[PDB]
């Protein structure tokens, strides 16, 4: 005879392969081959995953080095692999972080109103409805337009870059460059547009004219807008879609949350823990020789941190495949990563999902799949696991 084990194992986002637990038990770090032909170390236990993510010698930025073993081809300029470091070095971290909290005045009510309106529209049109294309994704897209302070009507055209921008491809993608360059010009226009005074782009636009930021490049400011829109929308849309499947498949849970919506945040934390939204391990490149379990990882080697390996590890989360709302370590999952690169949009992602699920349970308490679960079409060669359509009735 056979060839080296290949990753990823399955694009299905509704079930974890039995193979993951067997791997975790027998070889929690082991060699695998990625879609580019490169070799990598696949890490699958909670203990080893957290070790890698907490040790900055396993570098995110160095993954972009010419000649490194790759998980997939870049769909961004190599400097953007260090996007958070670049934000931090420009003195913009605190401002970005403040602009993307779900606590801004009126933002939550906007999310509720938007979710309610999307659902009323589905209800009027009649079953079946597609909860990804006509609910989760538009909710994500509308949230991010509002966060960024850009017009709602520009959401759809930005969003349509993302089926390419988030590909997980063996080779470079011509369309990713075309879209990237166009979306950057869009966000450069936004920084020059006097009507844009709110949200992240309103704040960046002010900071750009402030003498404390006069040497920050226009490229960086536009990049922040493109990347935060893209990462946020893909991540929240994907998460919410596959969380809705997990909830639909658990009518006793669906009913407990409908009846006691105060438990929704605890439900969302468990939906997060069990989520299979990330299609690949998180990539890092070793910058030193580092012992990880039984393997001495060598400098210049690629390591992949399998989030579901950690999140279903029974030594950290007993009965890992069960959603239990009373765990003693409920936010200790790795759905938002860990360490230097911990998700800066985590609070926003939680609130998007909370409010989407709250609205859906209230408007469609009888929600159920309208097709057998095996009929869902899983997107392949992508950085997220998502069903192309999510047909439901109620
Ligand atoms: C449920 C929703 C989300 C999930 C499950 C998620 C998950 C993740 C994870 C696992 C990472 C770590 C990647 C790594 O360490 O290699 C990450 C990083 C990132 N997330 Fe999220 N995230 C979500 C929502 C968002 C939102 C709403 C935004 C922005 C508006 C966002 C922006 C980013 C950015 C910019 C990074 C890179 C951070 C860095 O390189 O230091 N995310 N996220
Ligand atoms: O080290 C990396 C670098 C990038 C990524 N993921 C991404 N793939 N695509 C993009 C991307 C986002 C928006 C857009 O209009 C076009 C592309 C990302 C990405 C994800 C997070 C970022 O901080 C920057 C880029 C994942 C790991």
In brief:
It is classed as oxidoreductase. The chain has helices spanning 18-26, 46-53, 83-89, 93-99, 107-125, 132-148, 155-159, 162-165, 174-191, 199-207, 218-248, 251-259, 264-273, 307-311, 346-363; strands at 29-33, 39-43, 58-59, 129-130, 282-286, 290-292, 295-297, 302-305, 368-369, 391-393.
Main features:
394 residues, alpha+beta, Cytochrome p450, five-stranded mixed β-sheet, three-stranded antiparallel β-sheet, 10 strands, binds protoporphyrin IX containing FE, binds the ligand Oc1ccc(Nc2n[nH]c(-c3ccc(O)cc3)c2-c2ccc(O)cc2)cc1, oxidoreductase, P450, cYY
Task: Please characterize this protein's 3D structure.
There is one protein chain. By secondary structure, the protein is α+β, with helices and mostly antiparallel strands. It has a single domain (1-394), classed as Cytochrome P450 (Cytochrome p450, Orthogonal Bundle). The chain has helices at residues 18-26, 46-53, 83-89, 93-99, 107-125, 132-148, 155-159, 162-165, 174-191, 199-207, 218-248, 251-259, 264-273, 307-311, 346-363, and strands at residues 29-33, 39-43, 58-59, 129-130, 282-286, 290-292, 295-297, 302-305, 368-369, 391-393. The strands form 3 sheets. The protein has a 5-stranded mixed sheet with strand order 1-2-8-5-3. A 3-stranded antiparallel sheet has the order 4-10-9. Helix 6 (132-148) packs antiparallel against helix 11 (218-248) and helix 13 (264-273) packs across helix 15 (346-363). The longest helix has 31 residues, at 218-248. 43% of the residues are buried. Bound molecules: protoporphyrin IX containing FE and the ligand Oc1ccc(Nc2n[nH]c(-c3ccc(O)cc3)c2-c2ccc(O)cc2)cc1. Protoporphyrin IX containing FE binds at residues 60, 83-84, 100, 227-228, 231-232, 235-236, 239, 277, 282, 335-337, 341, 343-345, 348-349. It is classed as oxidoreductase. The entry lists the keywords P450, Oxidoreductase, cYY, C-C bond formation, Assumed cytosol. The assembly is monomeric.
């Amino acid at each position: 005879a056979t060839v080296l084990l290949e990753v990823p194992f399955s694009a299905r986002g509704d079930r974890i392969p039995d193979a993951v637990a067997e791997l975790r038990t027998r070889e929690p770090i082991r060699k695998v081959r990625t879609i580019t032909g490169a070799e990598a170390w696949l890490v699958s236990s909670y203990a080893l995953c957290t070790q890698v993510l907490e040790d900055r010698r396993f570098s995110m930025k160095e993954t972009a080095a010419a000649g490194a073993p790759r998980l997939n081809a870049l769909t961004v300029p190599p400097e953007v692999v260090n996007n958070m470091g670049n934000i931090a070095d420009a003195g913009l971290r605190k401002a970005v972080m403040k602009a993307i909290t779900p606590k801004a005045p009126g933002l939550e009510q906007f999310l509720r109103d938007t979710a309610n309106s999307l659902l009323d529209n589905l209800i009027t049109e009649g079953a079946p409805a597609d909860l990804r294309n006509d609910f989760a994704d538009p909710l994500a897209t509308a949230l991010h337009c509002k966060v960024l302070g850009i017009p709602q009507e520009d959401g759809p055209k930005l969003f349509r870059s993302l089926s390419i921008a988030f590909m997980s491809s063996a080779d470079p993608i011509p369309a990713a460059k075309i879209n990237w360059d166009r979306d950057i010009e869009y966000m450069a226009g936004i920084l020059e547009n006097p009507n844009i005074t709110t949200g992240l782009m309103g704040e960046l636009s002010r900071l750009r004219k402030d003498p404390a930021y006069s040497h920050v490049s226009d490229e960086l400011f536009a990049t922040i807008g493109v990347t935060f829109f893209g990462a946020g929308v893909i991540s929240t849309g994907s998460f919410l879609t596959t969380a809705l499947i997990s909830l639909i498949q658990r009518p006793q849970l669906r009913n407990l949350l409908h009846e006691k919506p105060e438990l929704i945040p605890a439900g969302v934390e468990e939906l997060l823990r069990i989520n299979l939204s990330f299609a690949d391990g998180l990539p890092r490149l070793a910058t030193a020789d580092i012992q990880v379990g039984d393997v001495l990882v060598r400098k210049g080697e690629l390591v992949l941190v399998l989030l579901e390996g950690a999140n279903f590890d029974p030594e950290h989360f007993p009965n890992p495949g069960s959603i239990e709302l009373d765990r003693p370590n409920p936010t200790s999952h790795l759905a938002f990563g860990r360490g230097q690169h911990f998700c800066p949009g985590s609070a926003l992602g939680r609130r998007h999902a909370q409010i989407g699920i709250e609205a859906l349970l209230k408007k469609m308490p009888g929600v159920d799949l309208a097709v057998p679960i095996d009929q869902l079409v899983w997107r392949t060669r992508f950085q997220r696991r998502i069903p192309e359509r999510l047909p439901v009735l109620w």
